[PDB]
Amino acid sequence: EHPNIIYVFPDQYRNQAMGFWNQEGFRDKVNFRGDPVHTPNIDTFARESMVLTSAQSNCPLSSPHRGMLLTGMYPNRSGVPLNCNSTRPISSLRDDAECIGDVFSKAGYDCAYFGKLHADFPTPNDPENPGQYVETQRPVWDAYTPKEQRHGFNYWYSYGTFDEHKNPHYWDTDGKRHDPKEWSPLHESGKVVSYLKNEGNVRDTKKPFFIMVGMNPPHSPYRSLNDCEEQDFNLYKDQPLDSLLIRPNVDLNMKKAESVRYYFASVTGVDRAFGQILEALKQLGLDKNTVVIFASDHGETMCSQRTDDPKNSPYSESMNIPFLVRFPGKIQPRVDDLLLSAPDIMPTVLGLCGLGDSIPSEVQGRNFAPLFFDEKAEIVRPAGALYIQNLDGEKDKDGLVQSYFPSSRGIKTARYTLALYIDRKTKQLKKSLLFDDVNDPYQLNNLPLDENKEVVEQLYREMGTMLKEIDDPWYTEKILSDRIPY
Ligand SMILES: CC(=O)N[C@H]1[C@H](O[C@H]2[C@H](O)[C@@H](O)[C@H](O)O[C@@H]2C(=O)O)O[C@H](CO)[C@H](OS(=O)(=O)O)[C@@H]1O[C@@H]1OC(C(=O)O)=C[C@H](O)[C@H]1O
Numbered sequence: 001e002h003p004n005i006i007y008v009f010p011d012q013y014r015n016q017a018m019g020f021w022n023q024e025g026f027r028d029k030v031n032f033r034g035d036p037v038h039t040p041n042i043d044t045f046a047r048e049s050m051v052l053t054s055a056q057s058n059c060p061l062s063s064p065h066r067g068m069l070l071t072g073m074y075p076n077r078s079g080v081p082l083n084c085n086s087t088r089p090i091s092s093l094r095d096d097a098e099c100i101g102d103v104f105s106k107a108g109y110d111c112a113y114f115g116k117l118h119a120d121f122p123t124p125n126d127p128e129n130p131g132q133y134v135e136t137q138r139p140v141w142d143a144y145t146p147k148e149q150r151h152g153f154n155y156w157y158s159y160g161t162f163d164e165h166k167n168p169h170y171w172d173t174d175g176k177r178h179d180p181k182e183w184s185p186l187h188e189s190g191k192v193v194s195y196l197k198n199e200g201n202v203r204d205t206k207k208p209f210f211i212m213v214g215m216n217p218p219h220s221p222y223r224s225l226n227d228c229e230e231q232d233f234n235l236y237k238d239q240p241l242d243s244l245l246i247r248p249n250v251d252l253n254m255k256k257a258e259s260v261r262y263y264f265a266s267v268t269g270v271d272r273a274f275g276q277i278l279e280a281l282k283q284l285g286l287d288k289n290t291v292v293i294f295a296s297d298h299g300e301t302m303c304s305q306r307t308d309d310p311k312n313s314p315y316s317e318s319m320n321i322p323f324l325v326r327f328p329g330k331i332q333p334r335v336d337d338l339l340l341s342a343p344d345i346m347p348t349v350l351g352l353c354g355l356g357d358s359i360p361s362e363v364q365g366r367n368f369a370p371l372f373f374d375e376k377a378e379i380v381r382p383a384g385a386l387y388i389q390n391l392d393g394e395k396d397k398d399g400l401v402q403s404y405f406p407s408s409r410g411i412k413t414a415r416y417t418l419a420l421y422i423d424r425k426t427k428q429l430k431k432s433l434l435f436d437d438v439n440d441p442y443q444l445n446n447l448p449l450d451e452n453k454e455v456v457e458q459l460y461r462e463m464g465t466m467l468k469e470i471d472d473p474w475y476t477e478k479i480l481s482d483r484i485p486y
């Protein structure tokens with residue numbers, strides 16, 4: 001048969017926010033000082049798994065990522081070019097896409113989704129106050145996902161988005177809303193343990209399972225004890241700011257900097273929650289039977305580059321996501337600088353569960369399962385992964401976004417981060433970031449393009465290839481045709 005799979009992906013979690021990057025072996029495999037975070041469960045897990053230094057969120061923003069995650073397609077084809085909200089009818093997960101849940105399901109898996117989905121355009125949808133939005137907030141951010149639209153998940157315990165961490169809410173398989181008054185991650189984790197124990201007979205123990213856990217923290221808020229457990233907070237409470245924010249690209253004097261205490265608390269708590277899932281696998285013997293992956297949708301600046309916006313930028317702090325894959329006696333624990341792109345996750349996870357031959361044709365990403373199973377595999381490693389920023393385009397008579405402005409395309413290679421920003425009226429180069437991530441890992445030194453013709457010309461060629469391959473708007477609109485060979 002085919003093994004079980006759990007994909008645990010807390011929102012807004014930097015690859016750099018993991019203890020083990022300062023630990024022996026690991027710390028020699030990355031250019032950065034890891035954040036001073038206490039993540040013991042993940043640290044141990046990392047010594048059992050293939051660990052990437054260089055997984056990329058091509059569009060480091062919730063819905064765009066989730067769209068690539070679930071469909072294995074870039075944001076021009078996922079259905080999901082923008083963050084989902086009542087402003088953006090143009091952005092919602094394609095009904096007609098053959099998603100990760102659909103393939104698993106079609107192959108005999110029970111599939112179960114816990115926590116944040118943030119992939120559907122809000123509608124007056126609400127199962128229990130019908131013809132009504134699920135919240136009053138305008139714009140509307142949250143959404144209910146009916147059985148018709150759950151792409152293979154026969155077990156639902158999930159919201160769209162809602163950032164009260166100790167007052168989260170969930171719709172069950174039947175559309176019943178639940179409001180425990182419990183810190184999201186530890187509730188989500190207890191709820192997963194129950195599904196694993198098959199309490200309430202919610203699952204067929206003869207079928208293998210596919211689980212996704214979309215934890216909200218360590219995403220905003222992170223201002224107070226409303227937003228994390230005092231237990232975790234106690235570790236960072238009194239620590240001076242210059243010993244929490246160690247990245248030399250940080251402005252310690254930003255109103256935001258204080259938030260690091262609570263970010264790290266949410267990180268330590270998320271680790272404790274992941275811990276409960278792992279122990280439940282061991283205590284039930286499912287540990288030997290199950291592919292486990294720890295990931296995020298995008299990172300967090302946390303005052304790095306004075307950005308104030310956690311993400312939606314090409315900085316290593318925004319693009320680089322954790323990616324840890326444990327599959328006992330199929331994957332040797334090791335570190336790998338594979339440049340995995342989000343749309344590669346779905347086909348690679350199917351590869352790993354031996355459903356490589358069931359990858360839908362519409363999928364744009366590639367199946368690196370062979371490379372996970374075999375260090376020494378004749379498989380081509382990517383040269384780069386695309387940077388993508390998509391903004392609101394034009395609006396209609398009723399003030400709704402009905403198109404997207406592709407504000408930035410760029411590339412991350414082994415050595416370089418390049419990001420080109422264009423103007424909405426005159427599709428002309430307006431700002432340009434270029435970093436030598438090897439010599440300038442905190443991206444302090446923005447390199448002029450004119451002073452680097454050999455390097456830039458190569459980056460322009462790799463962007464061209466990739467943008468043409470995914471049939472990206474920059475390609476179809478022959479944007480910067482004058483520097484980018486298509
Ligand atoms: C972090 C941020 O800048 N904006 C995100 C937003 O965060 C608000 C929270 O709801 C609140 O808890 C916190 O303390 O302050 C934020 C605020 O009031 O501005 O939450 C959104 C989801 O609930 C969303 O995050 S997302 O799910 O992770 O990706 C939002 O992200 C911003 O969204 C957009 C966009 O819709 O275009 C653009 C920004 O680049 C992105 O940072």
Ligand SMILES: [Ca+2]
Pocket residue numbers: 011012061062063219297298
């Ligand atoms: Ca997010």
